[PDB]
Ligand binder design. Structure first.
Ligand SMILES: COc1ccc(-c2coc3cc(O)cc(O)c3c2=O)cc1
Ligand SMILES: COc1ccc(-c2coc3cc(O)cc(O)c3c2=O)cc1
Lengths: 10, 235, 231, 9
């Protein structure tokens, strides 16, 4: 559950 | 099948210029930072906010969103500090001897002394900035190089798609230098000079990553979870 | 003298100056630990360094620099040069690294191996030519420490030599029949690999340093001194 | 420095 994962999905 | 490859050179340049993130400001305190904690405080706060814009810039680089989310993560994880650094060097170009971390955060090497190891990275950054100035690096060239870093730096720790887009950006760089009137020889010589600097930018990122992980273990400043995860990806 | 060489003379000079491929002390009948196996690599690298130092003298333009600058360039570039030599001679051994003719290893320290394997795979899918390889290796020597040094005259001579070698790479690609678009694309593909090689070198220098600290793998006096140059 | 003198001869 990386933050980068979330942020790349906007 | 990617829209990136069907773009013309001028369209690639326009997509990249329009994707550019803004120049952020540091916190507006009028103390020239002169300690490890205040220096690292301002820089990690700045990096954290720039990272949010970088992530949304990367999604606008043609070809990037055609990758799987996992490949997008890996490229950004690999490249983020290089991308921060080439941005720093680019906006420091017109300020010889200074590093413009933000319009209200202009540092010189004397301040690099207060953080352990930063004077060496500061010296490298300044030398890259000066090299960019002496080459008269153009903003259209700068955005091509930053996109090259994003797609290239993690590509071999993986394919054909990224390489086709990288070829597209080479075409675009040559296109810019021919539009600027350079001869054929000047074009390929200049292409080589620019790409060789990417080796130095990678070296500076690798060195900076070490000192950032060091500073994390010194617990000098709380790092954001986002910054921590981007750093941990290199460990 | 370097600046007046033609493209074909540059390639010949570089091809003539190639160092030899040395053997390791690997013995398949002898048991090895991860320790002693790593000692085989560091023992080999130490002996290659002696040949690299004498090869560097034969790189057009290198000895035109001060001894201090020659020292600096080799300190900065030595592991990159060892690694690009490794991936070159591993090209035709898919999935393996030919450290020596008697030492061909598979992934079965792990992370660096995968990176070297990826780079050689990249060289193989590009069909990297021997003439291009010796050009790249000389570029690394001259390029990797140039921004870490009137030592400003020295940098300018290095830039002119590096431009000369770019001219040489293009000449090679034109002779191979590539279109101009293909020449520029391949030139960029070749120079982008140098960023990955710099990356691999930085990582290996960090693992080398910790190996020193653990004091289990022997390291030669020259290897330690090179290592100290990177702090 | 070992490297310095190897370069000299
Ligand atoms: C302690 O090690 C380090 C290494 C690098 C940094 C650093 C953090 O924020 C930045 C923001 C930029 O826009 C450009 C940059 O170049 C940096 C850094 O270089 C901060 C601490
Ligand atoms: C522990 O990390 C490391 C540190 C150094 C090496 C290393 C040791 O000797 C070499 C000799 C070569 O000819 C080519 C090479 O590429 C290497 C290495 O890469 C390998 C792994």
């Amino acid at each position: 559950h990386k933050i980068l994962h979330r942020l790349l999905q906007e | 099948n990617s829209l990136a490859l069907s773009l013309t050179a001028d369209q690639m340049v326009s997509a990249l210029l329009d994707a550019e993130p803004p120049i952020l400001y540091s916190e507006y305190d009028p103390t020239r930072p002169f300690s490890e904690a205040s220096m690292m405080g301002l820089l990690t706060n700045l990096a954290d906010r720039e990272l949010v814009h970088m992530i949304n810039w990367a999604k606008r680089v043609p070809g990037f969103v055609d990758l799987t989310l996992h490949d997008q993560v890996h490229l950004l994880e690999c490249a983020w500090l290089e991308i921060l650094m080439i941005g720093l060097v680019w906006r420091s170009m017109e300020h010889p001897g200074k590093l413009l971390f933000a319009p209200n955060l202009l540092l010189d090497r004397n301040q690099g002394k207060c953080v352990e190891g930063m004077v060496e990275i500061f010296d490298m950054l300044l030398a890259t900035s000066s090299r960019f100035r002496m080459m008269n690096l153009q903003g259209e060239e700068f955005v091509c190089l930053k996109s090259i870093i994003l797609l290239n730096s993690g590509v071999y720790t993986f394919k054909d798609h990224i390489h086709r887009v990288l070829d597209k950006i080479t075409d675009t760089l040559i296109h810019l230098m021919a539009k600027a009137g350079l001869t054929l020889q000047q074009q390929h010589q200049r292409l080589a000079q620019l790409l060789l600097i990417l080796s130095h930018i990678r070296h500076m990122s690798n060195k900076g990553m070490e000192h950032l992980y060091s500073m994390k273990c010194k617990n000098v400043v709380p790092l954001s979870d986002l910054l921590l995860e981007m750093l941990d990806a290199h460990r």
